Amino acid sequence: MAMFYAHALGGYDENLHAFPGISSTVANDVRKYSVVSVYNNKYDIVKDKYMWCYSQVNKRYIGALLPMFECNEYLQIGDPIHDQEGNQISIITYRHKNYYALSGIGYESLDLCLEGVGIHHHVLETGNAVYGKVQHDYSTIKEKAKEMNALSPGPIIDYHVWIGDCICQVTAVDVHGKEIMRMRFKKGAVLPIP
Amino acid sequence: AMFYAHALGGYDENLHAFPGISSTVANDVRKYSVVSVYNNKYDIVKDKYMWCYSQVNKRYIGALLPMFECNEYLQIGDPIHDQEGNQISIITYRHKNYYALSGIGYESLDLCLEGVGIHHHVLETGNAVYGKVQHDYSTIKEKAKEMNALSPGPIIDYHVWIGDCICQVTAVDVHGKEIMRMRFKKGAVLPIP
Numbered sequence: 001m002a003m004f005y006a007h008a009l010g011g012y013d014e015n016l017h018a019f020p021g022i023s024s025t026v027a028n029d030v031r032k033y034s035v036v037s038v039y040n041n042k043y044d045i046v047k048d049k050y051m052w053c054y055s056q057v058n059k060r061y062i063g064a065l066l067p068m069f070e071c072n073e074y075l076q077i078g079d080p081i082h083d084q085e086g087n088q089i090s091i092i093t094y095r096h097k098n099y100y101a102l103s104g105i106g107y108e109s110l111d112l113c114l115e116g117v118g119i120h121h122h123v124l125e126t127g128n129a130v131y132g133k134v135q136h137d138y139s140t141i142k143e144k145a146k147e148m149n150a151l152s153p154g155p156i157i158d159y160h161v162w163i164g165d166c167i168c169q170v171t172a173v174d175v176h177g178k179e180i181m182r183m184r185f186k187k188g189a190v191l192p193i194p
Numbered sequence: 195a196m197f198y199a200h201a202l203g204g205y206d207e208n209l210h211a212f213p214g215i216s217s218t219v220a221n222d223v224r225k226y227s228v229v230s231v232y233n234n235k236y237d238i239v240k241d242k243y244m245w246c247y248s249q250v251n252k253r254y255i256g257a258l259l260p261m262f263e264c265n266e267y268l269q270i271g272d273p274i275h276d277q278e279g280n281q282i283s284i285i286t287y288r289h290k291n292y293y294a295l296s297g298i299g300y301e302s303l304d305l306c307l308e309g310v311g312i313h314h315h316v317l318e319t320g321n322a323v324y325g326k327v328q329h330d331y332s333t334i335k336e337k338a339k340e341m342n343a344l345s346p347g348p349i350i351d352y353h354v355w356i357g358d359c360i361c362q363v364t365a366v367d368v369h370g371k372e373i374m375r376m377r378f379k380k381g382a383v384l385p386i387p
Contacts, residue, residue, distance in 0.1 A: 153306040
């Protein structure tokens with residue numbers, strides 16, 4: 001039978017499959033579920049909105065956009081999540097108010113070696129723009145970008161994850177704050193609340 | 195609305211930039227299901243995309259774009275219209291009879307290329323990736339075990355892996371050790387130059 005261990009309960013195992021918050025003997029594609037069950041309750045997966053979840057274990061960052069389901073009850077880390085036939089497919093990992101992540105093989109992802117670099121997570125305000133390590137309104141960011149355009153790029157020292165209601169982005173900056181890289185994931189999402 | 199091809203020397207730093215295009219507008223091309231080129235309508239392909247990129251002035255601009263199928267040969271710079279006759283893009287990249295529709299598309303990667311290279315690969319179906327290589331699953335698993343011992347250095351190269359059900363980008367150090375990976379959960383093809 002498939003086994004699932006929560007990183008938050010010390011369950012990371014380098015020889016198992018790793019997903020945000022989970023080490024598992026199986027690699028389940030959780031994109032295909034529209035409903036899940038936990039204990040005696042069934043819950044619907046939210047359409048078109050996701051949760052950016054991540055764990056950091058052994059100087060390794062594992063982050064991804066995961067499906068989430070709505071549940072007004074409090075569920076605890078490690079509680080088994082089942083499909084409609086009663087097979088276990090995941091465990092409870094992360095929560096945002098009444099939303100719970102379904103961790104496994106999910107949507108867009110970021111994996112990082114954390115040697116020599118940091119990583120930071122931000123809620124991106126709707127209508128804000130991003131440059132490098134900051135968000136602000138479009139006019140302020142436009143002026144910020146002009147100021148930094150002149151700088152010569154140096155090596156990346158930090159990543160910044162920007163989780164917005166209609167787009168998710170990751171930027172990387174050098175020691176002067178110049179933007180060295182940007183990836184865009186065309187999905188809206190929320191971050192977990194610890 | 196103006197559209198200029200990077201391949202024809204049309205890059206303009208003060209205009210909107212997309213793979214192969216500088217434009218006075220930023221069109222969201224995800225919304226079109228039909229386009230027209232000259233007097234002919236073509237259907238956008240569902241659930242398969244084209245990774246297109248241009249590199250202009252030490253800046254890399256790459257993205258997954260919608261594409262349409264057209265048996266006739268279309269040339270770079272030819273106008274692409276919507277069904278109401280408004281120009282929305284220009285012909286940029288092609289893969290056999292698939293043509294990219296460039297503008298604001300799907301998942302994207304923008305990079306400063308000073309000090310680093312970037313390389314593009316067709317990911318074979320069923321293959322896995324580590325760092326700068328693809329291979330079958332078991333060989334990649336052994337590759338990762340070997341490389342796991344090396345200490346990570348600074349990123350020197352990015353590798354773009356374009357597959358039939360997934361696209362990935364890795365960043366590697368001088369040994370080929372994998373420093374970073376991003377995954378885009380879409381299938382795609384690369385342009386044929």
